[model samples]
Target: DLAERFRTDGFVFPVNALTHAEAEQALAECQTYLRAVSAVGGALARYAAFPKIHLVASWADRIVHHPAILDAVASLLGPDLLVWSTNLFIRPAYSGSSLAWHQDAVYLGLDGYQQHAARVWVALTDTTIANGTMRYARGSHLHGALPHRGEEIAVDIDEAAAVDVLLDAGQCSVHHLAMAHASGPNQTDTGRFNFAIDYITPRVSPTAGEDSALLVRGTDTGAFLPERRPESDFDQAALNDFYSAVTRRQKRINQTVQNR
Candidate 1:
């Protein structure tokens, strides 16, 4: 249901979502090292070219400690679910960084449809037009996924209904998969950075990609940490589906690149 809707409108945002201080604490303690990268200004690079960079190891205390945000998620996603993972996106000003337009589902490298995944993109600093702000197409998530428009995708979401997901310190937005959206470069003088965390129930398995992964907190491992859950008998099937899909994709990628 959520996934399908995202195909059209892409998605919507509820303002004043996550707070600035809360977003900062999580990013500060995060292992992604957004500030570590020196090439860009007011920015740091994270995930270090890996899939499913979990935040539990370094940022669990912040997420688990955040009750207001947690409760809101619980009310919508369900009370039984635990924190799947939290991701921090720090796009600094003058970083000249621009995330391509694509659906989160595509990267899963799964064979088909994906759903049940929700991301919390929190704004730790004041997001302004020049500093680069999140832009969403009207009902793009519901329109279903369009092919990746790496460069063709629009950065200025200024239509009457076209929503610009700008956040102040301490605000965030919930984006589900199937949402076709992208962020723009920070033309402003300051760095434009944000954090995106994922929350899901254990029932949903990671898709096929080998890098398809997540980080969790509380239940066991600490921040940027993932405690191995006793893989239930049911998990085997999930592992198989995910692995098989990934293997197939890798083969295709290798075949294409190796030809060179």
Candidate 2:
């Protein structure tokens, strides 16, 4: 039923993925890792722990491989899945940072395989309307890809029809890449933390240059270059690979933007 709802609405939520205590632990670990990176200073600090954070953070690796979340993803993307990327969307309390309306597919270069990709957004802290929870436009994925003028979606959307995806810490929501969504500034006294994992079926291949992916479940069609797990958190080899992948992705995204 959840998968069916996703097909119709472009997103679904309240999928409980972690216990409250576990969620809090993950958040603490992430914050600690972030602080460590900050302490390191200079260039490495700027790009180390994102896009493929699971490779550098053991806690993130565990969450991405958790069965509760993977099973839910398998239902929508079939049994075989590859983790394309991971990102941390953290907003400090009362920060004015916000995301404008946009579709992930627009710049991702997933192209023909967009429908096979989904993003699982896990809440590491309670996400409420007051603290920058994402808002989804009902069934907007059915519209296919839309034009974007800078960060904003090019066309006007029905703002009243959008629904806030509020969730308690430890819960998550799955959404299609084409789904139209955005979030507002966090106004609450506590910081907001979200861990987003991007998954794609093994059959999906990147439209951009060579990319790497970790096969989390079932069979891999060998469509992507293989990614290895870290022997220890932020293993040197893993960091090297992570940087390579991120650089490739940055070039791909920059090229896409230049042409658009």
Candidate 3:
């Protein structure tokens, strides 16, 4: 049932991917990440905590490879999996910004225009409509990659067709990479923080971003960049590694854009 739901709906939701304590630990790690990045606050700060956190933090690394989460992925994408990237969706309360309606990899032109990848969005805090929650157009992923106008920041969607994705703390939702989705701003007192673990079958090639990824399950298919693990979290060496990882990714994205 879970696998079928995912295949047809292009998304699945409120999965118990982590225990209560584990979710709290994730939240704490997020704070620590924020602290370290704030010290270097500026343009660098915005890109700091969220980029490639799993590479440098054991907590995030553990979550990315957690069996509970992997089980769902394996059901849909087969036994082999690669964790290509992870990101923190940190929206501070009262004035957070909205993301433009966009699908994750329209630009990359994924082979076959079909998505074999999904984002496991784990909630760190209670999410509500007023405080900003992801809204998705049901079954949109079936449409394949939508035409993204070069001048448009994101593809346009009919707002009335959206389904609000509200999750309690410790819950998670899975959405296909091609699923049309966006989130509203957090206008409440509580922060809307979440972690997104981007999982892919080795068959799906990435044309941009950091190519490195950890082999989460099955045999390494040589599709992902070499994996690296941090010696310690937030330590000087780890921070330096984190900075280098982001810088390298930014360089790649810039290069990809310039080639266009």
Candidate 4:
């Protein structure tokens, strides 16, 4: 079972869960321009627009619809699981981003006593040593999370001599919340994209707080996000202006879509 596999190995890479043709199409689909009209895109009065962010959220329902993937997860968590969140990461060609060492849990800001949250990483492309493949520290998750100790927002990544995770397209790696892991920077001419899906047993959540309780970034329960940053890392002055501007745009987009 995945639980036993993950517990002992810290990470698991199964066979190709997604076919080559389908994965190629999925990757191409992401390249097409799709604007994000949320609360942060423009002047007060329209929805914010992100070019190609949050692909996981875009494919949320569709993922659950993947009988093979969803059913496997359900069996692992019992039938009563709630997907806490869906994440997307894309490193275009030579993006030149380097992630330092860190654990999976500390950056998420979720309360640790629970230990009920975990992440499933889906590789949209066949990954290998040449493409800046994913990496992990074995037996790290089994030991629980280590405190934050790196410049990179992503935690528990071994910057040097990190173990490479090789897998074919469409396959995924299920990581425990405490697993110390990280991926390499995209070095190939093609983009490297991955999905970080968070799954939670219904038995949790109450400990994670709710609603506008806190931005998803602040929760302590290991949600596969960058580690907590100092206030200086953020520009409050700019955020105040940006967030206010986005709310206005989101409304206008909603109205426009509704009218159409």
Top model number, lDDT: 2
Best by TM-score: 2
How do the residues 1-260 of candidate 1 rate in per-residue lDDT, one tens digit apiece? 43334334545355355465666665555524433323333211332212222321334335433666665555445554444444445566577777665566544433222344466666767777667776766655543344442534333334455467866777766776656566777887766556566666444553422222333322421221233321332144433433343344455445533432
Residues forming the 10-long window of minimal summed lDDT in candidate 4: 209-218
Return the candidate ranking by lDDT, descending.
2, 3, 4, 1
TM-score of 1: 0.61
Q: For residues 116-162, could you state the per-residue lDDT of candidate 3 as single tens digits?
A: 78889888887789888888877878877665522322455778988
Tens digits of per-residue lDDT, candidate 2, 54-78, equal 8777888999999999999999888
Of candidate 1, the 10-residue stretch with the lowest lDDT total is 43-52
- Between 3 and 4, whose lDDT is larger? 3
lDDT of 2: 0.84
What overall lDDT goes with each candidate model? 0.49, 0.84, 0.74, 0.51
The residue-by-residue lDDT of candidate 4 on 1-260, one tens digit each, is 77566657666666335667666665555443123233233431131122112222223334433566656555455554445444556767987776665665554434431345566677778777867666777776755755452443334344564567776777777767777666567778987776566666534532232211112221343322221111221145434533443343344335533532
TM-score of each: 0.61, 0.95, 0.86, 0.65
User: Cα deviation in Å at residue 131, candidate 2?
Assistant: 0.8
The positional error of residue 27 in candidate 2, measured at the CA in angstroms, is 0.3
Candidate 3, superposed: residue stretches over 4 Å from native: 40-46, 107-113, 149-156, 208-210, 235-248
Residue 226's C-alpha lDDT in candidate 4?
Answer: 22
Ranking by TM-score: 2, 3, 4, 1
